[PDB]
Amino acid sequence: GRGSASLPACPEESPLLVGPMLIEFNMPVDLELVAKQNPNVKMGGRYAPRDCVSPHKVAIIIPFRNRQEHLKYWLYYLHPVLQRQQLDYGIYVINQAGDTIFNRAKLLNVGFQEALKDYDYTCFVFSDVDLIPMNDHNAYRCFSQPRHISVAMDKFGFSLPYVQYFGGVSALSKQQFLTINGFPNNYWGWGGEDDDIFNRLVFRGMSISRPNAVVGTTRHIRHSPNPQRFDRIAHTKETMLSDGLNSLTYQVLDVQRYPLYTQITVDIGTPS
Ligand SMILES: O=c1ccn([C@@H]2O[C@H](COP(=O)(O)OP(=O)(O)O)[C@@H](O)[C@H]2O)c(=O)[nH]1
Ligand SMILES: [Mn+2]
Incomplete structure (x- = not known):
């Protein structure tokens, strides 16, 4: 039964999962140690399984500006998890250059394109x-x-x-x-950019997929009022094809590959 053969696809669900994880944000994190503990993650925060081929080619995009301590927690917790999920992944931190109003959604678009x-x-x-x-x-x-x-x-x-x-x-x-x-x-701090995204998805006939809530629990790192749904549905239908990836403009000022992530510093302009 010998002969040259390809690596198998990774399984529908990874057999390496451990389930619940204790998440705490009260200790210091040292990225050199994190890299040492995650030796298989390559420069720029890239990893793919060695023994199977994942159909999941994932770019993880993080909107960012001056959250280095949180990022260190994110990297410390997520890298082990992402490798256990057997993903072919890369980490991208999209850093907004400047001090003007933060624009989360625009940095996410930048991440997709870069x-x-x-x-x-x-x-x-x-x-x-x-x-x-x-x-x-x-x-x-x-x-x-x-x-x-x-x-x-x-x-x-x-x-x-x-x-x-x-x-x-x-x-x-x-x-x-x-x-x-x-x-x-x-959406320059206006709020509701996620509701606009939801409206775009719905208008294109898509629905929302969600993991079972018991395993979908997440911890938020506190930093220095349950949200409500913003309207603007008509707005979204009016503007989605003319405002988005097609109209995206920005300047890449710096690209840094670190052992655990790639950081792209971009000038995304100011509110027009
Ligand atoms: O100065 C800022 C503001 C926001 N963010 C990013 O934007 C996300 C959401 O921002 P925030 O924590 O203020 O939550 P919001 O209330 O705006 O949902 C953060 O987790 C970061 O990834 C950032 O990096 N720097
Ligand atoms: Mn937050």
Whole structure:
């Protein structure tokens, strides 16, 4: 029964999962030690299983500005989890240059476009830097419908704020992201950019996929009021095809590959 053969696909669910994880933010983190403990993660925060081929080619995109301590917690907790999930992944921290109003959604678009320059990713996880999953059965990859990952956050009493809530951590396949023309680029702190994304998905006929809530629990790292759903549905229908990936503009000022992540510092302009 000999002969040259290809590596098998990785299994539907990884056999390496441990389930519940104790998440704490009260100790210091040293990235050199983290890299040493995660020796298989390559420069820029890249990893793929050695013994099987994952159909999950995932770019994990983190919107960022001055949250280095949270990032250190994110990297310390997520790298082991992502490897146990057997993903072919890369970590991208999209750092907003300057001191002007933060624009989360626009940095996420930047992440999608820049991660694609690196590799043919086919799934995109958009994750705030201060959310850590509490159970490794909460898969950080894409499904048949847009995936809402952080479904039961401790900050919201472990309950979904409203059925259309799509914030925190989500995953969209390349096909799913393209068909909604990405995310809006003009939410300069206004709030509700996640509701606009949800409206785009719905208008394109997509629904929300979610892990079972018991394994979808996440911890939020406190830093220096349950959200409510912002309207603007008509707005989204009016503007989604003209404001998004197609109209995205920015300047890349610095690209740094660190052992555990790639950081792209970009100038995304100011509110027009
Ligand atoms: O100065 C800032 C503001 C926001 N963020 C990123 O944006 C996410 C959400 O921002 P915030 O924690 O203020 O939550 P919001 O209330 O705006 O949902 C954070 O977790 C970070 O990933 C950041 O990096 N720096
Ligand atoms: Mn936060």
